[PDB]
Amino acid sequence: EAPAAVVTGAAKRIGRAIAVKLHQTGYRVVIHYHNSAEAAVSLADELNKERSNTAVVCQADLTNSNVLPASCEEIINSCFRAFGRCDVLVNNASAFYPTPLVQGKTVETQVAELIGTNAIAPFLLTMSFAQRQSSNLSIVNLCDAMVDQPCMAFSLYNMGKHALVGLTQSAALELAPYGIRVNGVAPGVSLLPVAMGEEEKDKWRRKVPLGRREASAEQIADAVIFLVSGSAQYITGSIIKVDGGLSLVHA
Amino acid sequence: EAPAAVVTGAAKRIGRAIAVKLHQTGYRVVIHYHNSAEAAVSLADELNKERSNTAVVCQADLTNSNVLPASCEEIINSCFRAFGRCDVLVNNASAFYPTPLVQGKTVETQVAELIGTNAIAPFLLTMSFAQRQKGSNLSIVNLCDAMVDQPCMAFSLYNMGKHALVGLTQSAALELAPYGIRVNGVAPGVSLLPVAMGEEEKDKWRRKVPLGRREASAEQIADAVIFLVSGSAQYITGSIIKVDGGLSLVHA
Amino acid sequence: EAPAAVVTGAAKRIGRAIAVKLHQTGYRVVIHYHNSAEAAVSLADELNKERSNTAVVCQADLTNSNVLPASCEEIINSCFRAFGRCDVLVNNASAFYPTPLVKTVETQVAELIGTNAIAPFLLTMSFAQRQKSSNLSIVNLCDAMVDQPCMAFSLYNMGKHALVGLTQSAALELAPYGIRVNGVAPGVSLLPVAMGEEEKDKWRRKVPLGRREASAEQIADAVIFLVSGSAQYITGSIIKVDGGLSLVHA
Amino acid sequence: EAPAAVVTGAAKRIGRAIAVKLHQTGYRVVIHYHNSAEAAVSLADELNKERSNTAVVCQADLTNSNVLPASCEEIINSCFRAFGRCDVLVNNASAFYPTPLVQKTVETQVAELIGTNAIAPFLLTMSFAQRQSNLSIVNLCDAMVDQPCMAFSLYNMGKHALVGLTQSAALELAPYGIRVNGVAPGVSLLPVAMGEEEKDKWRRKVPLGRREASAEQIADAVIFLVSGSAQYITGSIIKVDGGLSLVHA
Ligand SMILES: NC(=O)c1ccc[n+]([C@@H]2O[C@H](COP(=O)([O-])OP(=O)(O)OC[C@H]3O[C@@H](n4cnc5c(N)ncnc54)[C@H](OP(=O)(O)O)[C@@H]3O)[C@@H](O)[C@H]2O)c1
Ligand SMILES: NC(=O)c1ccc[n+]([C@@H]2O[C@H](COP(=O)([O-])OP(=O)(O)OC[C@H]3O[C@@H](n4cnc5c(N)ncnc54)[C@H](OP(=O)(O)O)[C@@H]3O)[C@@H](O)[C@H]2O)c1
Ligand SMILES: NC(=O)c1ccc[n+]([C@@H]2O[C@H](COP(=O)([O-])OP(=O)(O)OC[C@H]3O[C@@H](n4cnc5c(N)ncnc54)[C@H](OP(=O)(O)O)[C@@H]3O)[C@@H](O)[C@H]2O)c1
Ligand SMILES: NC(=O)c1ccc[n+]([C@@H]2O[C@H](COP(=O)([O-])OP(=O)(O)OC[C@H]3O[C@@H](n4cnc5c(N)ncnc54)[C@H](OP(=O)(O)O)[C@@H]3O)[C@@H](O)[C@H]2O)c1
Ligand SMILES: Nc1nc(=O)c2c(CCc3ccc(C(=O)N[C@@H](CCC(=O)O)C(=O)O)cc3)c[nH]c2[nH]1
Ligand SMILES: Nc1nc(=O)c2c(CCc3ccc(C(=O)N[C@@H](CCC(=O)O)C(=O)O)cc3)c[nH]c2[nH]1
Ligand SMILES: Nc1nc(=O)c2c(CCc3ccc(C(=O)N[C@@H](CCC(=O)O)C(=O)O)cc3)c[nH]c2[nH]1
Ligand SMILES: Nc1nc(=O)c2c(CCc3ccc(C(=O)N[C@@H](CCC(=O)O)C(=O)O)cc3)c[nH]c2[nH]1
């Protein structure tokens, strides 16, 4: 029987690349999305055309709130409803925008979105994943190789990604007796934001020692596929940088 | 004019010792508390007996909520009202309890309390501190955890909150450096053990500590805070000083 | 045509498993050894039985000395003379024993810092100087417990910390040549051969994931990943393969 | 009775400021030097004019060699000979120059860079510990050890090894009451041979004040770590870098 995976924020960009690579490896996939319905459905169509009834979409807001635990439970439930099992959880979805400390969304909403998507929803999904469980069960968190060299005015995003390191490690420890491995993949610069001008993209690209270019989405996905594979069966609590050396570069 | 400091969770234990040492160094102090009003006021009475009108109290819940930004602005405002300045912020207050991943409070309440006290309230307090200096030896000290990367079993939300606080310490150091505000951390290993912890369990922890087989006094933690806010640390920002007796170096 | 790899300390244990897995992946191998000639030769004969002319051995002491640069250049040269190319270097060989603060101390320095750090550096130098479709990389065998050191192992621990520095420094400097430099950090894998089972069990019981040590093959699996086409943007990274051991407090 | 300290590489720059501030704090000092004899003697003269018989010089090469253990033992011995005790060791001396991977012999470069930055600190730590209050060791680390400068591999290896020594020795020497810590500058006094434009480039990188640390600011962290206000601190490395290490590329 084929294994099944949940990928959050999987309609586009790195999450799509991860869903596609898992599918190509033989997984059935739940493509979670928030606003990108058309893209999520187009991806699911493509994957089901390759192999019937191996892709479903699942919509949810992962902003923090008192119903977020129920929403996260429902995402995991959606994998069991479609496929009867849930082997892999990939926490990819992420809000990302600056929140300057010195002076439109309220700061409460910014906290809820940035901390919710990058940390609290991963935690709740991890709880629900574990509660529902030869086998090769694992979680992969999308971290940030630059977490200790943060971008200016991104405090809440950075706090969220630091919390996600903590979750990765805490959950690795606590879920190891259940055979559930918990790891991270930490991009440096991969696909730059769609809104970024080409000159700003090239400023980042020129900083990367290995090739002066950003990681492709597929390169990020390659590290996720390794960590979910049998070739990583003793690996838990590890965060693999996929950054071309960027984090090693001084100012 | 004497400088002024805010210390969160200052009625007892490490926060109390930090407030006392700041006051002995010459600071005026805001003693923040949540439930410990009697002890906050007794501390203020002791400090004001030493120097009149140099200590005030301030009550607030630091759980995340719709009112937390306002609550944190009013803590910083209380320092300006009492003393006309706010030179130092010490983010000490902290909720601490296990949150197992597998199975009275709901998980969302636990998120609010553990992430609010350890991370979001420090962030909001940091914002309000800086904004009130938006136009001297100004600094922030965050109480971290030397064991952040060897966490206790079933403490995921606490640990996430302390990891977030490392990120805030570093992010705020970078962003606030142009304003001359330094942002640093002090990371205890084991200091004063929880009052509800059994004597046997306290001794198990003490026996793990390489340096002296004992926990840090609250005063030893406070000594590192005093260093970081002093003129002897004026080039130090974004640094987290472990005060742990070697505990974090000990393998399983 | 087949890529070629150098594996130091490849006659036994984790090095041997790495050499086997690289050979199974299609590499020609140089099996470096110091004292274990019979084991090195038996491995070579096994590999060449699988595919003729795909394995050679190379003897060298990797203790620090005045001759170590020449010894390291000769190891790399042996790969070129055998196979015409050198695509992968795996720095595995390692002296390991306690050196309490309270053999002469200069010999202990030479052996522990030489094998764990200075020979990796010199091999890296020589590897790169010969490279002054391709997928060139270096993998250093690190230690997941490098920041939670074992008592009285200061020189070993210094050597492994230096190896982290080498990994990162060489990743930065060699990136323009397309040479990636990464690490694999075991926690506990194969325990020392003479260690009593009761002592091995003290370690095993500490490992969150399965209460067991890693096989040599599981360590080799991470090396195979890092040298593969699936790791082409990964440089300067150290992958723990430790079952969560480094996360466990005292 | 006044405690005594050994400071390696103490004739000039950061080591000099450390020796001065320890002396001002009440320590007797051994001013170790390699080539800077005139400066070392000058410092000892200055400190002894303030308090007689409180400073001596001690010459040694700290390059790795088969005699380095003997040399390190003799530095510690020189503190006992002068002052009858040795309370503090500051491992400051350091060779620093690039060693490109793609192209002094390489063996000499290994010896100098790994010797001064790592092996000599280890042997001095051994000798300090064996010869034994508030005893401690402070190692001069590098806040940029994980964001290394191009072509500085051997230097960087030495500093990484020094982190390991700091931690290992903290663990092993704790039962003896000897604390072992580090101070990690980012940019402090820039090299004398660095050109002005390059110095200004480094300064402009520093978030906190766009200036390098003074030698005295680095010494201030050393003073803290040797003091009674650090009595529970061991195995800690304090960055004194103005935020430099937090700045991305
Ligand atoms: N791109 C990089 O260079 C880079 C660098 C470092 C780390 N990373 C990490 O790698 C991961 C993927 O990066 P990326 O650039 O592909 O991400 P992205 O495009 O910025 O965001 C991925 C998805 O997150 C979803 N999302 C955002 N807010 C949400 C919310 N409130 N509820 C639910 N889902 C929400 C969005 O789904 P919808 O579109 O359906 O609304 C979005 O498509 C992220 O965790 C990121 O932090 C990326
Ligand atoms: N003790 C240790 O060994 C240790 C180890 C590692 C790190 N640390 C860190 O060092 C700091 C001090 O430790 P500690 O043991 O002294 O702390 P603690 O006694 O556990 O807590 C300090 C104070 O936090 C306040 N607090 C808790 N929840 C709050 C809420 N919802 N709103 C506002 N304030 C709240 C309480 O104030 P009221 O009493 O007024 O309600 C409490 O007295 C903490 O940040 C802790 O994480 C301590
Ligand atoms: N085993 C573990 O649990 C563990 C844990 C953490 C890290 N690691 C690392 O993983 C790697 C492999 O571990 P392992 O246990 O397989 O290693 P090992 O058996 O201790 O040693 C591997 C080989 O190193 C060679 N070696 C030792 N001293 C040498 C010298 N002076 N010159 C040249 N070669 C020398 C020996 O070759 P000959 O036999 O031919 O003389 C030996 O067989 C090492 O780097 C180790 O530090 C292992
Ligand atoms: N300056 C910075 O910005 C900076 C940045 C990061 C870290 N640090 C660290 O802080 C420390 C002090 O830095 P610094 O700039 O003051 O150092 P420095 O001037 O580069 O060197 C200090 C002294 O080291 C001695 N030394 C060099 N090679 C030696 C050898 N073979 N044997 C014995 N002693 C030798 C020299 O003594 P003689 O003059 O007597 O020959 C020299 O004066 C060093 O550990 C350095 O790595 C400094
Ligand atoms: N979820 C998620 N999505 C991403 O795209 C992403 C990245 C991409 C890299 C990146 C880093 C900094 C800025 C940056 O400096 N942004 C500034 C300036 C933008 C500009 O100049 O266009 C901003 O204000 O956004 C913009 C992009 C990192 N982490 C991420 N996480
Ligand atoms: N705010 C705050 N207050 C504190 O008192 C405190 C401490 C004290 C140290 C401490 C450590 C473990 C446990 C503990 O409960 N351990 C678990 C066992 C799990 C484990 O230790 O891995 C227990 O049930 O004993 C309880 C207390 C750390 N961080 C803190 N932050
Ligand atoms: N190269 C290399 N080879 C290895 O085998 C290895 C290991 C194996 C793990 C390990 C850790 C500590 C001790 C330990 O405590 N050893 C003590 C006691 C041994 C015993 O009790 O039998 C020692 O004195 O050797 C022995 C073994 C780590 N790093 C290594 N690097
Ligand atoms: N002992 C010791 N003495 C020092 O003076 C010192 C320093 C000072 C800072 C420093 C930084 C870079 C270069 C430098 O040379 N940079 C190269 C460019 C490479 C790069 O910066 O990545 C150059 O040629 O400038 C030279 C000096 C750091 N560590 C030190 N240790």
The reply to whether B158 sits in an annotated binding site is: yes
* Distances A182 to A22, A83, A176, C243, C250 between C-alpha atoms, Å: 17, 22, 8, 10, 21
Residues B190 and B247: beta-carbon distance below 8 Å: yes
How many of the other CB atoms lie within 10 Å of CB of D53? Answer: 9
Are B172 and A130 within 8 A, CB to CB? no
> Which residues lie below 8 Å from residue B109, measured CB to CB, with a gap of 6+?
none
Ligand in nearest proximity to the CA of A224: 1
Kindly list the catalytic residues of B. 145, 158
Are C247 and B150 within 8 A, CB to CB? yes
d(CA B6, CA B2) in angstroms, rounded, equals: 13
CATH superfamily ID and name for D1-249: NAD(P)-binding Rossmann-like Domain (3.40.50.720)
Could you tell me where the DSSP H helices lie in B84-196?
A: 107-115, 121-132, 156-176
Which resolution in angstroms does this entry have?
Answer: 1.1
- In short, whether D212's Cβ falls inside 6 Å of ligand 8 is no
Name the nearest CA neighbour of C30 among C3, C49, C9, C58: C58
Contact residues, chain B, for D179 at CB < 8 Å: 211
C43-63 burial code (b ≥16 CB/10 A, e <16)? bbeebeeeeeebbbbbbbbbb
**DSSP SS3 for D28:** strand
d(CA A131, CA B156) in angstroms, rounded, equals: 15
The whole-angstrom distance between D102's CA and the closest CA on chain C is 5
Structure tokens at D44: 């000892």
Tell the burial category of B193 from Cβ atoms under 10 Å away from its Cβ (0-12, 13-18, 19+). Answer: middle
From the CA of C4, how far away is ligand 2's center (Å)? Answer: 58
- N residues, chain A: 251
Residues A201 and A189: beta-carbon distance below 8 Å: no
d(CA A50, CA A53) in angstroms, rounded, equals: 9
Atom of ligand 5 at shortest distance to CA of A193?
A: 5
**Partners of D178 in beta bridges:** D135
Residue C142: half-sphere exposure toward Cβ, Cα within 13 Å:
30
> Which residues lie below 8 Å from residue B56, measured CB to CB, with a gap of 6+?
B29, B30, B31, B44, B78, B82, B83
Name the nearest CA neighbour of A89 among A168, A173, A191, A193: A168
Which of residues 169 through 228 in chain B touch D, CB cutoff 8 A? Answer: 170, 173-174, 177-178, 180, 182, 210-212, 216-217, 220, 223-224, 226-227
Structure tokens at A184: 């991270």
Name the nearest CA neighbour of A242 among A61, A7, A14, A8: A14
3-state DSSP of C144-166: CCCCCCCCCCHHHHHHHHHHHHH
Are A103 and B149 within 8 A, CB to CB? no
Atom of ligand 5 at shortest distance to CA of A157?
A: 31
Residues C175 and D249: beta-carbon distance below 8 Å: no
Segments of chain D assigned E as strands: 4-7, 28-33, 55-59, 88-91, 135-140, 178-185, 237-240
Residues C6 and C86: beta-carbon distance below 8 Å: yes
d(CA A21, CA A227) in angstroms, rounded, equals: 13
d(CA B17, CA B23) in angstroms, rounded, equals: 10
Protein residue with least CA distance to atom 28, ligand 2 = B95
- Under DSSP, the state recorded for B28 is E
Which sign does the torsion angle of CA C16, C22, C26, C28 carry? negative
Could you tell me where the DSSP H helices lie in B56-120?
A: 68-83, 107-115
The reply to whether D159 sits in an annotated binding site is: yes
The reply to whether D195 sits in an annotated binding site is: no
- N residues, chain C: 250
Structure tokens at A206: 């020129």
d(CA D142, CA D182) in angstroms, rounded, equals: 9
State the Cα angle at C33 between C30 and C35, rounded to 5°: 160
Name the nearest CA neighbour of D134 among D231, D219, D224: D231
Helical (H) or strand (E) element with B33: strand B28-33
Q: Which residue of D has its CA nearest to A209?
A: D249
Structure tokens at C30: 């140089």
Contact residues, chain D, for C165 at CB < 8 Å: 145, 148, 153, 156-157, 159-161
Tell the burial category of D69 from Cβ atoms under 10 Å away from its Cβ (0-12, 13-18, 19+). Answer: buried
Are C247 and B208 within 8 A, CB to CB? no
Are D172 and C161 within 8 A, CB to CB? no
CB contacts < 8 Å between B and D, how many?
105
Atom of ligand 7 at shortest distance to CA of C195?
A: 22
Residues D31 and D7: beta-carbon distance below 8 Å: yes
Ligand in nearest proximity to the CA of D193: 8
- Under DSSP, the state recorded for D149 is P
Tell the burial category of B212 from Cβ atoms under 10 Å away from its Cβ (0-12, 13-18, 19+). Answer: middle
D210-230 burial code (b ≥16 CB/10 A, e <16)? eebbebbbbbbbbbbbbbebb
DSSP codes, A181-206: EEEEEEESS-SPPTTS-HHHHHHHHT
d(CA B33, CA B75) in angstroms, rounded, equals: 10
Q: Which residue of B has its CA nearest to C145?
A: B251
The reply to whether B143 sits in an annotated binding site is: no
User: What is B1-252's CATH topology?
Assistant: Rossmann fold (3.40.50)
| Domains of chain C by residue range | 1-250
Name the nearest CA neighbour of A29 among A56, A9, A2: A56
From the CA of C191, how far away is ligand 7's center (Å)? Answer: 7
The whole-angstrom distance between B23's CA and the closest CA on chain D is 17
d(CA D209, CA D204) in angstroms, rounded, equals: 9
- In short, whether D241's Cβ falls inside 6 Å of ligand 4 is no
Kindly list the catalytic residues of A. 144, 157
d(CA C30, CA D63) in angstroms, rounded, equals: 34
Residues A102 and A48: beta-carbon distance below 8 Å: no
The reply to whether B235 sits in an annotated binding site is: no
d(CA B144, CA A162) in angstroms, rounded, equals: 13
Helical (H) or strand (E) element with D208: none
Which residue reads 């931690």 in tokens?
D167
CATH classification code of C1-250? 3.40.50.720
The whole-angstrom distance between C139's CA and the closest CA on chain A is 14
**Selecting from 3.30.70.1430, 3.40.50.720, 3.90.180.10, 3.40.50.300, what CATH number does the domain A1-251 have?**
3.40.50.720
The whole-angstrom distance between C84's CA and the closest CA on chain A is 25
Residues B15 and B7: beta-carbon distance below 8 Å: yes
**Partners of B26 in beta bridges:** none
Fill in the amino acid letter for C147: D
Kindly list the catalytic residues of C. 143, 156
Which sign does the torsion angle of CA B8, B11, B15, B18 carry? positive
Ligand in nearest proximity to the CA of C92: 3
Residues C243 and A176: beta-carbon distance below 8 Å: yes
Name the nearest CA neighbour of D240 among D209, D224, D217: D217
Distance between start and end Cα atoms, chain B: 50
Atom of ligand 1 at shortest distance to CA of A186?
A: 7
**Partners of C30 in beta bridges:** C6, C56
DSSP codes, chain C: ---EEEETT-SSHHHHHHHHHHHHHT-EEEEEESS-HHHHHHHHHHHHHHSTT-EEEEE---S-STTHHHHHHHHHHHHHHHHS---EEEE-------------HHHHHHHHHIIIIIHHHHHHHHHHHTT-----EEEEE--TTTTSPPTT-HHHHHHHHHHHHHHHHHHHHHGGGT-EEEEEEESS-SPPTT--HHHHHHHHTT-TTTSSPPPHHHHHHHHHHHHSGGGTT--S-EEEESTTGGG---
* Distances C83 to C18, C79, C86, C93, C146 between C-alpha atoms, Å: 18, 6, 8, 22, 35
Which sign does the torsion angle of CA D107, D112, D118, D120 carry? positive
Are D146 and A207 within 8 A, CB to CB? no
d(CA C248, CA B149) in angstroms, rounded, equals: 9
CB-nearest to D249 from A148, A150, A251 is A251
